[PDB]
Amino acid sequence: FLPLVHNIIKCMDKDQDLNALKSKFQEMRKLISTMPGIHLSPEQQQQQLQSLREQVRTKNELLQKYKSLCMFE
Amino acid sequence: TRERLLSALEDLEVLSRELIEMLAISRENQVLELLIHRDGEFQELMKLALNQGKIHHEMQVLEKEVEKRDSDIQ
Amino acid sequence: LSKMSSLLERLHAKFWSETIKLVRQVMEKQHLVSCLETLQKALKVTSLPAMTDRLESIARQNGLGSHLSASGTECYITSDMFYVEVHHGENPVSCPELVQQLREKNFDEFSKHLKGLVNLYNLPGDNKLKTKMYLALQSLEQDLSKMAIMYWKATNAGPLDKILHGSVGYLTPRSGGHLMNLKYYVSPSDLLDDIILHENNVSRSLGMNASVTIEGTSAVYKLPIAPLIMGSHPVDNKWTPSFNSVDLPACFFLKFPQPIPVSRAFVQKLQNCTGIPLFETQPTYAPLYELITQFELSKDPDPIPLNHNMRFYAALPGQQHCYFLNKDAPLPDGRSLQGTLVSKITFQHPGRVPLILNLIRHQVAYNTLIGSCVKRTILKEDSPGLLQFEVCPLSESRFSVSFQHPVNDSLVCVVMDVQDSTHVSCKLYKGLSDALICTDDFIAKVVQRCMSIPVTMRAIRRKAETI
């Protein structure tokens, strides 16, 4: 957003709407970049990363508990 | 960065609005130091937005992994 | 805290292309616009035009006549300086100091040595006498090499001897704002850091300098525009008489980074040797005892006052010392060693300088001996140690240290003096019923090792503890 303000001040010194238009372009690209973010909190993301890792690990754990035991005599 | 981008958007926009007339009435730096303060601020945000983007899309893969795993369990 | 008002004001002002339209209409229908741009120059990203505007911003503070010639070449136009970067002459040298400072982000010291040439051309002449004094400066500057060459011709010794106990000092070259300085003292307490080797790639700040430049005075002295040495002695230098010369209103000045608490006798020593008086006006002469303490308490300065209150303390690793310098002793004249602080030294011709320096070299070692007692180390209410040392003055650059005997309760009165640049004789007076403590060759050795006093007052105590 800083080069937009620099373009504004250089344009007004040498002699705006287009700079505001690309500022709105930055706003809509930030809106695209909203669905990655605080939808689920980043701290909560840190906690549920361990939840997903524990899910993977307990799924694997039940898999080798099913496979490992010799149910045959 | 959701409420953060809009806060960075509205602060930088009205401060850029502020700098228009103070240049016009001359023909200060206290309002200028907040500009660069929010400039290096908000440069963290789209980097953190893509940090959220890479993290969000990484989780898309991981839940696609465990969906097959659970289906393989299923 | 101005952001909350900035957030509040713009939110109300929200309730924006007319602002751009009003600004263009106000524009369509001096210093302060340059002021906001210069305050924006630190905010500008580096490029070819931006550093050009940065140097022009610098030249606004320096006051130089701003001329741009290209995107890479700029010419500095003023009264007595003309050089290009990527008067009465071209650029003397495109020195690597100028080139490397502009190549990197040393734009601040770009302004400093621009003003050093202003300091080199701050003469009040009509710009003809300016060069002449500068020529008399240069003739002096041409001479300044010769003594360094002469003493190198005299002996091929180390730079320390050229600094400590030789003619002139160390010929630090002048370069733009840099002037030719001369190096004269260091104690080995100062010299050893953390043991620094004495190679010629020496820092320009490691110690204290005798910087020489000219300064235009109301007083007029006959200074040689031509060199003063055309005939030279085999190991000495020989000075031809002045005149070419003309009555140039200046004198050659010797400058130091610090004021030297110098003796009264040193003042008449310098008044007699040059002929030009050291004092144009008389200050109130105070004793040298309180001059060295503030001289030797501020070299590692602190905002907190220490306030030793004439008792000094030495938090030493091996012993504990308490000091009484005894300003204003019952001397038979009734007066102690009075003195002043000096950094200006006047001399008309290059023959005056090397003898003045020996007097300074005689003078400075006395400051470092005396101020070795003077310390920031504050060890407090310690019943062990805290020996009663009473220093007492004896003569100019002389004193004695009478103190409680450790072995007996008698006195040892250690008569001490400075006799040369760093030469120090040592004398022992003692109680009449007393034993061997030291030889004064050992005392001279430790002084010629470090020339300090609490070390010696330890080492004497160490040598007394042995015997």
Curated annotation (Swiss-Prot), chain A:
Q: Keyword annotations for this protein? A: Acetylation, Activator, Coiled coil, Nucleus, Phosphoprotein, Transcription, Transcription regulation
Give a GO cellular-component term: nucleoplasm
Report the record's disulfide bonds. none
Localization, per the record, is:
Nucleus
Give a GO molecular function annotation for the protein: transcription coregulator activity
Annotated coiled-coil positions are: 43-70
Superkingdom of origin: Eukaryota
In the record, biological process GO terms are: positive regulation of transcription elongation by RNA polymerase II; positive regulation of transcription initiation by RNA polymerase II; RNA polymerase II preinitiation complex assembly
The modified positions for Phosphoserine read S41
Q: What is its main location?
A: nucleus
Q: According to its UniProt record, which protein family does this protein belong to?
A: Belongs to the Mediator complex subunit 9 family.
What the protein does comes down to: Component of the Mediator complex, a coactivator involved in the regulated transcription of nearly all RNA polymerase II-dependent genes. Mediator functions as a bridge to convey information from gene-specific regulatory proteins to the basal RNA polymerase II transcription machinery. Mediator is recruited to promoters by direct interactions with regulatory proteins and serves as a scaffold for the assembly of a functional preinitiation complex with RNA polymerase II and the general transcription factors.
Q: Partners and quaternary state?
A: Component of the Mediator complex, which is composed of MED1, MED4, MED6, MED7, MED8, MED9, MED10, MED11, MED12, MED13, MED13L, MED14, MED15, MED16, MED17, MED18, MED19, MED20, MED21, MED22, MED23, MED24, MED25, MED26, MED27, MED29, MED30, MED31, CCNC, CDK8 and CDC2L6/CDK11. The MED12, MED13, CCNC and CDK8 subunits form a distinct module termed the CDK8 module. Mediator containing the CDK8 module is less active than Mediator lacking this module in supporting transcriptional activation.
From the Swiss-Prot or TrEMBL record, give the protein name. Answer: Mediator of RNA polymerase II transcription subunit 9
> What species does this protein belong to?
Homo sapiens (Human)
Curated annotation (Swiss-Prot), chain B:
Q: Which UniProt keywords apply?
A: Acetylation, Activator, Coiled coil, Nucleus, Phosphoprotein, Transcription, Transcription regulation
One cellular component (GO) term of this entry? core mediator complex
Record carries keyword Acetylation? yes
Which parts of the chain are coiled coil?
Answer: 1-23
Q: Which residues carry this modification: Phosphoserine?
A: S7
Q: Answer whether the UniProt record assigns the keyword Transcription to this protein.
A: yes
Output one GO MF annotation: nuclear vitamin D receptor binding
Q: Where in the cell is it found?
A: Nucleus
Q: Which GO terms describe its biological process?
A: positive regulation of DNA-templated transcription; positive regulation of transcription elongation by RNA polymerase II; positive regulation of transcription initiation by RNA polymerase II; regulation of transcription by RNA polymerase II; RNA polymerase II preinitiation complex assembly; transcription by RNA polymerase II
Superkingdom, natural source:
Eukaryota
Q: Which family does it belong to?
A: Belongs to the Mediator complex subunit 4 family.
Subunit architecture? Component of the Mediator complex, which is composed of MED1, MED4, MED6, MED7, MED8, MED9, MED10, MED11, MED12, MED13, MED13L, MED14, MED15, MED16, MED17, MED18, MED19, MED20, MED21, MED22, MED23, MED24, MED25, MED26, MED27, MED29, MED30, MED31, CCNC, CDK8 and CDC2L6/CDK11. The MED12, MED13, CCNC and CDK8 subunits form a distinct module termed the CDK8 module. Mediator containing the CDK8 module is less active than Mediator lacking this module in supporting transcriptional activation.
Give the protein's function: Component of the Mediator complex, a coactivator involved in the regulated transcription of nearly all RNA polymerase II-dependent genes. Mediator functions as a bridge to convey information from gene-specific regulatory proteins to the basal RNA polymerase II transcription machinery. Mediator is recruited to promoters by direct interactions with regulatory proteins and serves as a scaffold for the assembly of a functional preinitiation complex with RNA polymerase II and the general transcription factors.
Protein name per UniProt: Mediator of RNA polymerase II transcription subunit 4
**Record organism:** Homo sapiens (Human)
From Swiss-Prot, chain C:
Q: Which domain of life is it from?
A: Eukaryota
Modifications the protein undergoes after translation, according to the UniProt entry: Phosphorylated by MAPK1 or MAPK3 during G2/M phase which may enhance protein stability and promote entry into the nucleolus. Phosphorylation increases its interaction with PSIP1.
Q: Subcellular localization, per the record?
A: Nucleus
Positions in coiled-coil regions: none
Assembly and binders? Component of the Mediator complex, which is composed of MED1, MED4, MED6, MED7, MED8, MED9, MED10, MED11, MED12, MED13, MED13L, MED14, MED15, MED16, MED17, MED18, MED19, MED20, MED21, MED22, MED23, MED24, MED25, MED26, MED27, MED29, MED30, MED31, CCNC, CDK8 and CDC2L6/CDK11. The MED12, MED13, CCNC and CDK8 subunits form a distinct module termed the CDK8 module. Mediator containing the CDK8 module is less active than Mediator lacking this module in supporting transcriptional activation.
Which family is this sequence assigned to?
Belongs to the Mediator complex subunit 1 family.
Record-given protein name: Mediator of RNA polymerase II transcription subunit 1
Task: Tell me the stretch of the parent sequence this chain holds.
Answer: 13 to 518 of 1581
